[PDB]
Amino acid sequence: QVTFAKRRNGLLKKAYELSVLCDAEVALIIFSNRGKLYEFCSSSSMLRTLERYQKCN
Amino acid sequence: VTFAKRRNGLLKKAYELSVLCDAEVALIIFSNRGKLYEFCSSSSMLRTLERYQKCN
């Protein structure tokens, strides 16, 4: 997927921007079709954000 | 607020990435008031988070 790198980088960047601009807590997990993991979390740790998520629902 | 705009944009682009590049995507967003928004491309958010935990 020739556009994968571009879209991935764009999404990681915009996730970061949302967290910075709006004081929002953001977690983003991406697996490529080859199974490569890319991720962003705005908080002290991804685990903490996932734990926060589970507590709602 | 431009929170709404950027949020909607991110949710949409996450969807596009999953569809256009056959990628598995999970996205969790808490507003500064603690409102939860989310997108997951798979059958369930839990399954994708479980996949995530299995890596390093």
From Swiss-Prot, chain B:
Compartments reported by the entry: Nucleus
Highest taxon of source: Eukaryota
Phenotype of the disrupted gene, per the record: Triple mutations in the SEP1, SEP2 and SEP3 genes result in the replacement of the stamens and petals by sepals and of the carpels by a new mutant flower with sepaloid organs.
Residue ranges constituting the MADS-box domain according to the UniProt record: 1-39
Stated role: Probable transcription factor active in inflorescence development and floral organogenesis. Functions with SEPALLATA1/AGL2 and SEPALLATA2/AGL4 to ensure proper development of petals, stamens and carpels and to prevent the indeterminate growth of the flower meristem. Interacts with APETALA1, AGAMOUS or APETALA3/PISTILLATA to form complexes, that could be involved in genes regulation during floral meristem development. Binds specifically to the CArG box DNA sequence 5'-CC (A/T)6 GG-3'.
Subunit composition and interactions: Forms homodimers. Heterodimer with AP1 or AG capable of binding to CArG-box sequences. Binds AP3/PI to form a ternary complex. Interacts with AGL16. Interacts with TT16/AGL32.
UniProt-recorded name of the protein: Developmental protein SEPALLATA 3
Organism: Arabidopsis thaliana
UniProt lineage: Eukaryota, Viridiplantae, Streptophyta, Embryophyta, Tracheophyta
Shown stretch of the complete protein: 19 to 74 of 251
